[PDB]
Amino acid sequence: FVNQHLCGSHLVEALYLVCGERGFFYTPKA
Amino acid sequence: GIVEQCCTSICSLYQLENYCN
C-alpha cells in the first residue's frame, strides 16, 4: 500500500500505519 | 517535501519512514 501515489488522507493513513506508536509529522508545505 | 516525493511522484517505505518520529 506504500508504493503508489499517496495524497491527502491517503498519505496520512499510510504514515499512521507505517509509523505506528512512534507517531509522525505531516507537513504539506515544506 | 513529502507531497512531492509521495503524492506527485510514487512513494516508498524508505521515504515514509523519514517522517516518523
From Swiss-Prot, chain B:
Q: What are the cysteine partners in each disulfide bond?
A: 6-11
* Annotated protein name in UniProt: Insulin A chain
Phylogenetic lineage: Eukaryota, Metazoa, Chordata, Craniata, Vertebrata
